[PDB]
């Protein structure tokens, strides 16, 4: 499903809607959504 990263483990966690928002390695409750896969375009100017 959609991926997230723990705030203090950098561990990748795929979670669904029914899942409780926690880290499965340390129990931390702050999660950061993963980087998008679609390309990003920047003007070097």
């Amino acid at each position: 499903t959609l991926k997230y990263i723990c705030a203090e483990c950098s561990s990748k966690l795929s979670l669904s809607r029914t899942d409780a928002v926690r880290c499965k390695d340390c129990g931390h409750r702050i999660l950061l959504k993963a980087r998008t896969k679609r390309l990003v375009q920047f003007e070097a100017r």
Partner: protein
């Protein structure tokens, strides 16, 4: 943050003279003026670019990465 690539005023490339500057200040025990003159920065526009730079990137690098692979 990190050393600017080019001098704002004239455009001389000064981004490759930072580590050499730190080495001259550390290894050779040169003062700032002689070190700047040794790197070829003769206009004071470039001398203020290198002389007044504050390298904040190190402080940022002290924190642990958010996404570690």
């Amino acid at each position: 943050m990190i050393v600017p690539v080019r001098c704002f005023s004239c455009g001389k490339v000064v981004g490759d003279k930072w580590e050499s500057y730190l080495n001259l200040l550390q290894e050779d025990e040169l003062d700032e003026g002689t070190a700047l003159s040794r790197l070829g920065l003769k206009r004071y526009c470039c001398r203020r670019m290198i002389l007044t730079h504050v390298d904040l990137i190190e402080k940022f690098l002290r924190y642990n990465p958010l996404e570690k692979r």
